[PDB]
Swiss-Prot record, chains A, B, C:
Organism listed in the record: Methylorubrum extorquens (strain ATCC 14718 / DSM 1338 / JCM 2805 / NCIMB 9133 / AM1)
Catalytic activity: 5,10-methylenetetrahydromethanopterin + NADP(+) = 5,10-methenyl-5,6,7,8-tetrahydromethanopterin + NADPH; (6R)-5,10-methylene-5,6,7,8-tetrahydrofolate + NADP(+) = (6R)-5,10-methenyltetrahydrofolate + NADPH
Pathway(s) the chain acts in: One-carbon metabolism; formaldehyde degradation; formate from formaldehyde (H(4)MPT route): step 2/5
Protein name as catalogued: Bifunctional protein MdtA
Intracellular or extracellular location(s): Cytoplasm
């Protein structure tokens, strides 16, 4: 049976980026919808679960995306709620790389740390965005003590609460209103991640290369000035003294291979649910 | 040339359901448009008749669908009106199974009745919806005396009027405002169809099993409580005493095979017109 | 890698005509977008340049279309503005045949004129439209002295100015509000083109067959009454004295093959730019 991927995007039109990776991941056909909401998605899902029977269902899958992570999560919950008994197909969530980027970043760092980050301290700068929140969740799942930083404590704590409730973890929030507070926040930390706006530096070279505790840094901003000063976007475990750096492009290469591989996994069963945890498990197999 | 199916849906976005079945029917590519009307479909049809020549024409086809059956009928008429001479492609009309479901159901009932229902009484309960009206039409075309029932007489009559004009038959209307009136309407009938809302019973076991005239019952509601009480949705001619029943899933199994086969037909010539008549003709060959 | 064509249409929905030709041109998959604008196309382009590395890039391409030619040009310029360094894919512009129909018509007329039309007078009746404007531009590029006629000097000069600024040529504009004036504008002309509204005659038989100077006439209206009286929609260099005529269908035959051929070229490298210049260069090779 032809592998059919139904792309439900919360934005006005479907992501061109997600279409290309979907074909490279092995979908035979991709049918996309924009403006998808928890309300209109149920009827779309009915179309995926009442048209094919038995083994054939694994040949149809769903991919929910768009730029707003919270909206994508609402649609993704409405999709899982529509399934009934054996009437379901595999589904995946990744809003603008919120899951695949974060999973690639954290898997690369955990691998470079020796396989475990349990009991160590990780600080996620500008962690209130999609990738920062998901990175915080996966790090907390690995047993790291995580601090999620934001410009205002209310937003940082609201992000940490959301993460804690969804993932059953205990991330801590912290307010870093300026450059100085971010330089402070990373003191004593073993792993530092920067998940801020494009073309914005959050951690100058001097703010990390002198901190003895810091073992590995990771940056998700691919456009100079980079989130982390002193590295190159293509760095992937490059050594700076006794520390290792992961630039946004090094992480991005794994994320692309990972996103592709996930789509392929959607068609190997009709019960897969690829959100943060499952995507991360695959990211560790591929890092 | 690749087999290209153009899906024109009268709803805001194209039916996911129709897309999967279309691909399982052999289309190599399906390109869908929502918000199609008699005014804008013309330009779309032009794109299908002026891009391929010779025998290559049969490799492009049109499928009109959506939830509003009358809206689809108006688009379908506008599509045919756009064709001229040999400048045409095969086309099919099916609004959420208006044609394919009704044809699968009536073909199975006529077959179980021994090939003819000529001169016998058929009653369609809650028959003002698409599948109810096309069922009434097909039954009337087979020579059956048909009573189309609705909660309000004017709606039932408007439904019968529509059927009678489109199909040149004389289906009669009746008001059945409650369970008591529905039970009465079936007295003396030979065939009974329930085409009511999902998850709603219209004819308890006691209202059909003790009526000697009733030979076969068919129900289009697959969600319990089923439209017909005392049967299972999977029933496909199962015997209840001297009567036979067809559940919504039993009919639906044939409907899926029929709908796929119709799509395949569209690419076999450039002059196919798959509306109630032709689809019902194929359903009888397949039942 | 599968050959992915991304269609950006400025109209509300993507052209069905362009989808069929794009698939017959060799695209493995076409993903179309309506309502594209200079502002929202940038993110669509990013999805084509950040998803495939190295030589896999030539397996993704872009096609800009829609009815409004100037709108298409703005989007096309925006697409090219988004590329940078090696981060690019081939792109094509053709707004309802604006480039492929005019390229087909001009190339046919030039070939029939002996291969050179420099120093000769060419008149385009009702050439304020896309095909008219592009035909006027290609003729100017060939060295002909071109006159672009419109019902009002007002829009005629605007069309001419648009052409001259875009292709660096010196097209002249003339107002022909009467049948009489159109008959007058062609006296002394060697080549005449009619690019008027569908089903409208611009140049009656008696207005071109008795004019000594006229060598070839070309008409883009395929629906009777034709723009040029006395010919047949299918003439492809047919003789009517020492003269020759190209009807819209004769020209359209080459336009189809040319448009398919351009699509195939988009997948041979990631640096192709198919606008009037390159399309015409291929049109001459194929005429």
């Amino acid at each position: 049976s032809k592998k059919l991927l139904f792309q439900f995007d919360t934005d006005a039109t479907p992501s061109v980026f997600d279409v290309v990776v979907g074909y490279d991941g092995g979908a035979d056909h991709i049918t996309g919808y924009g403006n998808v909401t928890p309300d209109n998605v149920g009827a779309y899902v009915d179309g995926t679960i009442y048209t094919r029977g038995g083994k054939e269902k694994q040949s149809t899958a769903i991919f929910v995306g768009g730029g707003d992570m919270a909206a994508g999560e609402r649609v993704f919950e409405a999709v899982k709620k529509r399934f009934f008994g054996p009437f379901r197909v595999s589904c995946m969530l990744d809003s603008n790389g919120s899951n695949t980027t974060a999973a690639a970043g954290v898997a690369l760092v955990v691998k470079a740390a020796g396989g475990s980050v349990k009991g160590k301290k990780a600080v996620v700068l500008a962690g209130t965005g999609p990738v920062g929140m998901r990175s915080a969740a996966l790090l907390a799942g690995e047993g790291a003590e995580v601090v999620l930083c934001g410009r205002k404590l209310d937003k940082a704590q609201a992000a940490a609460d959301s993460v804690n409730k969804r993932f059953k973890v205990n991330v801590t929030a912290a307010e870093t209103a300026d450059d100085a507070s971010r330089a402070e926040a990373v003191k004593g930390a073993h792993f530092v991640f920067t998940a801020g706006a494009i073309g914005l530096e959050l951690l100058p070279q001097a703010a990390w290369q002198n901190e003895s505790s810091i073992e590995i840094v990771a940056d998700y901003n691919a456009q100079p000035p980079l989130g982390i000063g002193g590295i190159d976007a293509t760095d992937k475990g490059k050594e700076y003294g006794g520390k290792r750096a992961f630039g946004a492009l090094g992480i991005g290469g794994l994320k692309l291979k990972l996103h592709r591989a996930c789509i392929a996994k959607l068609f190997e069963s009709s019960e897969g649910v690829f959100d943060a945890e499952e995507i991360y498990k695959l990211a560790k197999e591929m890092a």
